[PDB]
C-alpha cells in the first residue's frame, strides 16, 4: 500500500576531533592538519643558493682568515654558519659585530675589488705566526698591516674616490699592542691614531695598549671597523700609527640574501622553506618547527596541532 523514503548522511567509525567556537572537542568525519611540525632534518640545496660555511664564520671569510679564503668572491642566498667554526688568524674583535655580520649577509656577496693604495713611507704586508698562510707567517688576505719603514712612521694621508655607480664597503682595523715597547717598535710613535672619513661621516680611533688574555700566542688585538662610500663620495684614510689598512672594497648589493645558524646537513632536494632544523614543506599555513626561517614559509605559531574540519559532524550512533 506504500513505501518509505529516508534521507541521510554518511558517517565513519572513527572520525577526528576538532575545536569550534563552542566546543573544545567535537568529532567530524575528516580534518586536515594546519600546523607543520616535522622536518626531514636536512637543508635542501634548491632552489636557494646555500653556502655552507663549514669551519668559517661569515666575518672570518670576509676578513680573509687563511683557512676561510676558499670563500673569496662567493655569493649566497643563505649563508649557513656551523657551530664548529673557529678563527685561526690574528685575535680580533668587531665593535657592533652583529650589524656588520648582518649587512654583509644581507648583501649576499663577498665580491672583492683590489684598489691601488699608495702607502708612502711604511712597510707593508705585515704578518704573524698566529695567522699562518702556508708554512710561513701571514695575515688576513683583505687587510694590510702597515709598520714603520726603517726608523720613521710618517703621517699617512691617502684618498680613494668612488666613481662607480654602486656603494663600496671598506673593512679596516686598528692594532692594539699589549706593551709600549711593541707600540714604538712597530709604529715609532707612542700613541697611534686612525681616522677614516667620507664627506658626510667620520670615525677616529685611538688604540689602547695593554694585555688581554692570550689567544693563539698573542695578548694584543685588532679591532675591525667598516665604512661605506656612496657614489660620488670620497674615502680618506689618515693615520700616524696602528692602521690595519684596506686592500680594496667589497661590492654592496641589495636583495633577498641572509644568514642562518644551523648544524643540519645539506642535501640535494627541493624545498622553498628552510629552518635551522632543516627544510620544511610550506603547504600548510602555520608551522611549529622554528621561529627562525628563510624563504616562503608557514607562519610560526605556538600550537603543535590545529585540525581544520573537512567533513560534517560524525554521528555513527
Amino acid at each position: 500500500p506504500g513505501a518509505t523514503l529516508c534521507l541521510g548522511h554518511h558517517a565513519v567509525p572513527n572520525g577526528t576531533l576538532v575545536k569550534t567556537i563552542t566546543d573544545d572537542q567535537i568529532e567530524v568525519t575528516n580534518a586536515t592538519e594546519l600546523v607543520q611540525s616535522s622536518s626531514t632534518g636536512k637543508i635542501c640545496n634548491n632552489p636557494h643558493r646555500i653556502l655552507d660555511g663549514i669551519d668559517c664564520t661569515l666575518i672570518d671569510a670576509l676578513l680573509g682568515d687563511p683557512h676561510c679564503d676558499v670563500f673569496q668572491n662567493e655569493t649566497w642566498d643563505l649563508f649557513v654558519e656551523r657551530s664548529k667554526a673557529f678563527s685561526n688568524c690574528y685575535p680580533y674583535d668587531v665593535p657592533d659585530y652583529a650589524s656588520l655580520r648582518s649587512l654583509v649577509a644581507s648583501s649576499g656577496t663577498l665580491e672583492f675589488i683590489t684598489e691601488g693604495f699608495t702607502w708612502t713611507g711604511v712597510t707593508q704586508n705585515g704578518g704573524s705566526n698566529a695567522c699562518k698562510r702556508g708554512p710561513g707567517s701571514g695575515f688576513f688576505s683583505r687587510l694590510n698591516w702597515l709598520t714603520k719603514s726603517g726608523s720613521t712612521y710618517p703621517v699617512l694621508n691617502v684618498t680613494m674616490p668612488n666613481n662607480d655607480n654602486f656603494d663600496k664597503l671598506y673593512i679596516w682595523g686598528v692594532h692594539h699592542p699589549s706593551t709600549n715597547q711593541e707600540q714604538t717598535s712597530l709604529y715609532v710613535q707612542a700613541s697611534g691614531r686612525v681616522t677614516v672619513s667620507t664627506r658626510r661621516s667620520q670615525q677616529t680611533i685611538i688604540p689602547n695598549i695593554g694585555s688581554r688574555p692570550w689567544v693563539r700566542g698573542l695578548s694584543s688585538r685588532i679591532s675591525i671597523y667598516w665604512t661605506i662610500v656612496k657614489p660620488g663620495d670620497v674615502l680618506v684614510i689618515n693615520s700616524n700609527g696602528n692602521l690595519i689598512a684596506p686592500r680594496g672594497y667589497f661590492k654592496m648589493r641589495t636583495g633577498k640574501s641572509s644568514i642562518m645558524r644551523s648544524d643540519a646537513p645539506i642535501d640535494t632536494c627541493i624545498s622553498e622553506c628552510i629552518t635551522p632544523n632543516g627544510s620544511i614543506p610550506n603547504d600548510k599555513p602555520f608551522q611549529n618547527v622554528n621561529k627562525i626561517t628563510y624563504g616562503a614559509c608557514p607562519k610560526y605559531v605556538k600550537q603543535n596541532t590545529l585540525k581544520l574540519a573537512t567533513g560534517m559532524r560524525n554521528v555513527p550512533e
Partner: protein, 171 residues
C-alpha cells in the same frame, strides 16, 4: 548544528553510504535500496574545498628577519628584539586559533544545512502524497516501485499521477 538535521532529527549517520555524503534509502514492494545524492554531496564538497583553498593562499614569503636567538646577555635592544618576536608569535597564534575555530563552526553548520535543504526539497517534491515521519523519512501513500523512487531521486516525479491514490490512503 544550527539547522537541527545532522545530530538532530536525523538520529545518526550511515557508515554504509560510501559513494556520497548525503542520499536516500527506501523500502518498497520490491525490496530496499540506497543511493547517494550527487548535487548535495558536491555542494558540500565544493564549499569545503573553497575554504581550504582560501586558507593556504597568501601565507608566505619573508627574507630578512631579525635575529631571534642570542648567545650573550645584552640588555635593552635584545629585550626589544625578543618582545617584538614574542608579541608577533602571540598575535599569529591567536589568529590561527580563532580562524580554525570559526571555520570549523561554519563547516558543521553548512553541512547540517545541506542535509536540511535536501530533506525540504524532497518533501516539496512529494505534494500531499507523503508525510514527514519526523525522523528524516517520508511515508509515501501509494505504490512506489523502483522506477518511482528513482523518479523522486532524479527530480522528475510527477505528484499529480499519484495524488488521487495517495489522498485516498491518507484520509
Amino acid at each position: 548544528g544550527l539547522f537541527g538535521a545532522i545530530a538532530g532529527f536525523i538520529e545518526n549517520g550511515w557508515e554504509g553510504m560510501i559513494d556520497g555524503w548525503y542520499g536516500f534509502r527506501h523500502q518498497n514492494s520490491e525490496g530496499t535500496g540506497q543511493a547517494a545524492d550527487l548535487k548535495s554531496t558536491q555542494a558540500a564538497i565544493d564549499q569545503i574545498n573553497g575554504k581550504l583553498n582560501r586558507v593556504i593562499e597568501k601565507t608566505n614569503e619573508k627574507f630578512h628577519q631579525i635575529e631571534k636567538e642570542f648567545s650573550e646577555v645584552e640588555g635593552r635592544i635584545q629585550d626589544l628584539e625578543k618582545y617584538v618576536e614574542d608579541t608577533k608569535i602571540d598575535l599569529w597564534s591567536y589568529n590561527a586559533e580563532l580562524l580554525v575555530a570559526l571555520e570549523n563552526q561554519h563547516t558543521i553548520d553548512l553541512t547540517d544545512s545541506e542535509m536540511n535543504k535536501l530533506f525540504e526539497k524532497t518533501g516539496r517534491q512529494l505534494r500531499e502524497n507523503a508525510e514527514d515521519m519526523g525522523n528524516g523519512c517520508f511515508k509515501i501513500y501509494h505504490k512506489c516501485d523502483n522506477a518511482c523512487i528513482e523518479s523522486i531521486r532524479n527530480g522528475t516525479y510527477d505528484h499529480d499521477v499519484y495524488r488521487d491514490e495517495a489522498l485516498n490512503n491518507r484520509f
